[model samples]
Target chain A: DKNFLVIDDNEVFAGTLARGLERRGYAVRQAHNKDEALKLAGAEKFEFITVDLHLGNDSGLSLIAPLCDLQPDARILVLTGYASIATAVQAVKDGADNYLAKPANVESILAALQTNASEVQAEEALENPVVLSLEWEHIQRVLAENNNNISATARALNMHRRTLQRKLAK
Target chain B: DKNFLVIDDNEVFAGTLARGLERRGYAVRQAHNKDEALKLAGAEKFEFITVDLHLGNDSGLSLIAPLCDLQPDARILVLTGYASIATAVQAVKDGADNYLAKPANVESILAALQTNASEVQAEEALENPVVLSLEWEHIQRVLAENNNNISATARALNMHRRTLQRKLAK
Candidate 1:
């Protein structure tokens, strides 16, 4: 059903993300904390869910297992402002389908969702020889979503136009 | 020189693990605390390092950055009694080359060491359809190391011999 649930303590971010997903034709429900997220999860089976790593003082990691228990087939993606290997492993082991560091936009989140969670682990494998600049990758992703409009890409990425141009110079 | 450093609070485990590596021709050093580990890291260039996730009241995670700063070329692996996606992500992000949950023997440690970090991420991709029973996989690993001796495998795994047989039946 393309039903989605978004759990984040920040109302503005949650609302904005929900709007973005809604524009992409998802029926999204928003939750600001662990309790609300759990209640909604129990009440309805969401096909997709995005959980912010921090929900007030409570952890979003704790919710992954329960959410998976309630909706076994749901695709759960963990979002965090600060990305770390430890939290990513815990989230995936707890049944999160994906983990993404913050500044993720609709395009990037969609890309992560489409990716196999196992691939995420492989990508992080330290032995892999390829190294890509994460900042540049992020910029390119947002730019693609903005149809390569420099100003629009900068706005979407929340970066100054000059900074965007400077980054692209690299 | 195949120099290796082992950081763990449990003296016995650290000693045993170090001995195992030493048997593989690695010159091993041991550290029981963050201070000891950091001091040793700065004093020598280790080619390999293994860190336990917990060291009394301290975290092994906090040591990764410092260790990397001291020896950028060392392949660091984080080992924990409990396996979670969170800790793995943090470990990798913090400069650990790889992460493995506990009951990891020398064989598995060697395997993880040889693997590219990016491949590790790919292996954990949740979208991958392959699903194996973890308990059975672990049993097989220890059994192979024991040359298929049921009793030795049981002893190595710290399981009842009869329970081992029961598991093999499945």
Candidate 2:
């Protein structure tokens, strides 16, 4: 499963990319410019970002640094037709997880996403302290799933009304 | 300008999709399961929905018909790698706005969005007895955006605070 944000000024290309990915079981959103992308970024966090370098003087490069600052955990993949060794190196230094030249194949994009997902999972495993309580994790997951509905959480987890009360109290 | 929902069981794929759509300036939301999707749909109306056909015996087809019932105006597009002509036709017959085979390109997905968007706009133009009043819609939008704060909604809409209160009261 892949999720993507495709920023391109060209409508045809953007549409193509969006449709292509959806067929491949990837969720994709499209933005034509920097302002829109920024707004979306502010609203919700994304796992991976694919940005075209040129966006009508709104360089994706400028966006990469700020977006990385905002979401250090997100993988930013820069896509550009004007690829150069120096530019690719610079993009990585500026917080891009990977850089690829345009007319990217599905294999390349998928490979990049796999790498990023693995990296994030590894980091999460490292940072999160191991806990003995599966019940706590289950509670957390239920809360997340139900958006904190106490009754629903209790029912789904098959815990007693007072049991959930006790868990939350703790 | 577009609101989208992406349904899949895979978190990594869902995240990729959220980021992709966010990059494209669309307000995109994801659901890893039917329960979460039901809650999301109940909370907000979406313009478009992209669903995977197979969802762990939950059956994406089952979801589509109900979603159509929930939001008659929304366009549902089914994506399946295990596509068949019969399934494609059935999907359209069963309330899906469109169906695409697996490994679809961005071009096709974007085209579907464009087609749905245009069709929705046209339908609203012709069938809606009363056009969406920008003034009233703006009031509602701003209020929602401001989390029901009259003052913030007023400031964002560039209207007097009292004016918004009056409108809401109406």
Candidate 3:
């Protein structure tokens, strides 16, 4: 069985994910914060890793490079409840194989890890390509950083909360 | 011969680009502002149109939709001195067939216009892909908006100019 590590700040999320992975027949470990994550990562090589975007005060993005160093071939998937273009791009630059937004299930996570190697080659074969909207990306990131608080996100973006609500209606 | 319209606020740049297109056996016209561009686009259907990202106080992005409406089959390419991920994504969203940075020659512009259609299909075939760095994209956009002044770019980003220099050295 391939080994997997899930690093998330939410203890419930970490536990649930571990149980799910176990059901899928994988050997799994969980880390609740940066220190525990790095300690676990340094001790053993995992075939896959899922890192939450935020781990208390620490950013999960910082762990990507070290995880890659610890297990060069490991498929590191960065998960964020606040998936923004800015962080998504940063995740790839830091050597993440894939980046997924929150609410992603076990199947999707597995698929993200499995599809990355082939997709990287496929994407490189193309020339210029379309990408997500920057405004939308910025809004999403701000909203995420504000922990999905509409008023906070609106204030942060210097827009009215209603306007932010209208934007997020879809 | 393929007909091309070169829309730019810089008379010198537009003239040079038009001349280059003519040499490449393309029938070419030049427009210095939004009014001239829209008037020309409304009158004739050109095979290709190159729009500068900014046209004096008017944004070239706003013109894309109208240009597309006027000539549905025309290959529209957005050219900007300050290429940012935000503007680049917006350009495509606005129906630009391609986007290129400034100082691009006739050969490169032609390639951008020509290669877009095929590359679009190729990109769609890929599952997930890598994109340019957001930080780099943000820096370049700010630098461009500030007219390539390192001090202004750094100030806008709230970073030291020396730090910006270090980032841009490569």
Candidate 4:
């Protein structure tokens, strides 16, 4: 059984999830705030970590970059009640293995965990295909960020303006 | 119960969605073709309509503009598997209340319905907020289209090059 960490400012939600995961035959730990969660995470490794976006005064996104450094192999799943397309995209960009919207049931949580675990494992051995390269993904992201501005996109990507124009034309 | 209509050339997908909606306490109807949908909608009004982009050989977008004539109150939600951001924006321009990427699930379907319902109700006493004009959205769209070339964007918007440069500076 996988060891899971549930982190949320809401005690009720964190408790409920811990109980549910325990019932599902997994070892679970619960933390009501980011500091406590980070302290617990530093003590022992977890197979999976679920971080809620609203963690008291601190944004969960701030913790993600550090958490990835601390536990390189652990699958991090972000849970948020306020779902925004931009935030979801940013979470993935910030090293989150996956994301789940709030009010998620046991099935959805388990599915996200399972999918992330398998994907993380696959990503370990892979050279990261150039077609699916992070660079290519970053290009798409920057274009989207610049509102599809090729000149700004080219400047942002550190390439000549004509290079971006040719890429878009293709 | 709210009346919902599903229009898709794929009979199986439409049937499945209709059945799912029916089970979720909605009065659901299905149409495999635009003509059938128009006939059913003409006979009885629907509160919400989910239209597939590809309607056999017919243009689903063409259906939306005329729908305002048939059922002014009906909120059209365009559903498609192959949707681009440009096409999604175009669908909204063509009278679709919202554009959803398929295969849509219960959550997205319900969210789309809720958004359409709210938008429809808001239309009753719609007051344009004096924050920004369509001129800005048009400029943004044109800038995106021209890949943020000052000359090209100004040409597309029919403004002087220096005028665009001044506006962009702000």
Candidate 5:
């Protein structure tokens, strides 16, 4: 159902994924670093890309837009081992669809390629109470509505400022 | 092949996961909050326990050691949609075995239960160039060794105190 470019600094890992994806009927190729990735993307007409955030010494996060430029419809999945809010934010700005921290297997990769809704992918699933307690959820919800401005969140929640901040701090 | 306790404040999500996992042969039990989880964990033994990181006002993370006390070898999988280094550090210390984010399917949950290795479950799988660069990983690695004492980590990494702090801030 897809054509994919498996890009990672680890040759063994990338090649193995290429083979695994190929076995599952995905037309797959691999690139071991940014140069290889750019080269492949420039030459290939794949519909999907699985990019490693860290490629040996280079950052794969930077390659997203370039890959997108080459194949506007291609889906770019950013896979990382040292994931952080910083890298995640940066990658999305470059037009990446998904961010996955590693130990990811074939099926996970396949699913990511299919549905690109990030909200259901990482933070939202884990962050919201989605409530541990009514009061807590109410307070947090108000705080969120106030755009996480601690002072504003407290004021809107009708709670004492210091108390709300302290609790959040804890 | 396994028994699992699905813990969350959301009923729909819990029931959905229970049904899906049930179809996959996991004898699954559901709990909507801490009291229920504690009660179920107290009386019933499951091969795995999946806890949400944000349980309303309660921290699902706080449940780890207690669950470990009740079932030492039971794999405690933290099913967090958002990946947080802070909670991951705490959960690992508390003996939680895995961290997964949102939109994770039946296959993903099964895999999380099977290996139960937090290191393998999340960032370690993809994010690690920590390069935060060569500098960042070095700083973080030393920080971990020094029990996260910034001053000590900086000294060991041979960087300035303020300089190290700024790097981390980035």
Candidate 6:
């Protein structure tokens, strides 16, 4: 059976999560950065991939398309503490199979990966949308689109880097 | 010259903070869990120790007393994303020199360590007490006393773990 690939900056979380997955009968390989993750992805085939939204100063979103390129059949999920609707939509569009918020345990991760993700469905309709979440999502969407480049994201958002950082930090 | 030890479940954050500190003419080492932190402390003596209260599933507070045992002179500080006056007080009482909330850059960490921390000094009290923050602090304080065991904390606070988690998640 193909093992799970866990990419996260939190070593303890990664180890514990892997152990949890192991208990669930899923083997796991872990990585703490882009290079390690890339190397792992290159070395072996993975049935599932979980990437942290923020890998230190680098965004894990950068890995989505690459992993997709590497394994078109893999289930790709972005796990983030910086939960935003915009980022979720962007992730789905960026070849990510799903987006999950932090505090999600192995059980939730297993379920999300098992059922997997669906498209943003651009033409989908909605009502009473939370404007604030929408703006946050849009900012994340823009940030991801720019390959997580702070300078370019700031320019595109028409805000100073400091301003963008402040908003993101908040 | 004194050396610094940074401990957090987030390897990315711990390493990032270590790099910033290193740029400030200080030697720094980083670890991502209690065992790793204790192991580092064992291998070498660090003058300053900064620990994240949430180390994946373990509470960093659990390390404070043991670290103090290992190095009596170590200036231990607790860094947490869940900042609360309660936790700050609890950390100090549990053998920490200071408590800092997350999003703290190196400069702030430097200042807190250099100046050292004093309890809400007479003249330094906030002009307006945010009752909301106070409540959060109270909860956290209780949680810390219980060694960050959610169930015990909830029981002590007459709250359900479900309720406490809901509040903490926010």
The prediction achieving the highest TM-score against the true structure is: 1
Tens digit of per-residue lDDT, candidate 4, span B1-170: 38888888999988888887889788988877778878888888888898886788666766777776787898778776543322333455456676554544665566665543433322221121111016667777887776445434543554433234334432
lDDT of 5 by residue, B13-108 (tens): 899889988888889998888888899999988888899877766668778889999988787777754333334434554666655544456666
Which structure is stronger by DockQ: 1 or 2?
1
lDDT per residue for candidate 6 within A113-155, as digits (tens), equals: 7541221111010111111007779878987787555434644
Candidate 3 lDDT by residue in tens digits, B115-139: 4332442222121221221788888
The i-RMS of every model, in angstroms, reads 20.5, 23.3, 19.2, 20.3, 15.7, 18.8
lDDT of each: 0.68, 0.58, 0.66, 0.61, 0.64, 0.63
TM-score of each: 0.43, 0.34, 0.42, 0.38, 0.41, 0.40
Over 4 Å off, model 4: A116-170, B1-170
- Models, CA RMSD each: 20.3, 22.6, 17.4, 21.2, 16.5, 22.1
lDDT of 3 by residue, A71-164 (tens): 8979888775544333443456467777655554676577768743324322221222212117788988987776555434644664433234
Instruction: State in Å the error of residue A143, model 4.
Output: 21
Span of 10 residues, lowest total lDDT, candidate 2 chain B: B124-133
TM-score per candidate for chain A alone = 0.70, 0.63, 0.71, 0.66, 0.71, 0.68
Query: How would you encode candidate 2's per-residue C-alpha lDDT over B1-170 as one tens digit per residue?
Result: 48888887777766766776778787998987888878887888898888876665566766877888887888787765433222333354456766554343444555555444333322222221111116677667767766555434544654333223323441
- Computed on C-alphas against the true complex, the DockQ of each candidate is 0.04, 0.02, 0.03, 0.01, 0.04, 0.01
TM-score of chain B of each: 0.71, 0.63, 0.72, 0.66, 0.69, 0.71
Count of backbone clashes for each model? Answer: 45, 27, 0, 0, 17, 1
The C-alpha local distance difference test score for the whole of candidate 1 amounts to: 0.68
* Runs in model 3 lying further than 4 Å from the true structure: A1-170, B117-155, B158-170
Better of 4 and 5 by lDDT: 5
Ranking by TM-score: 1, 3, 5, 6, 4, 2
Query: Could you tell which candidate, 3 or 6, scores higher by lDDT?
Result: 3
What pairs collide in candidate 6? A86-A137
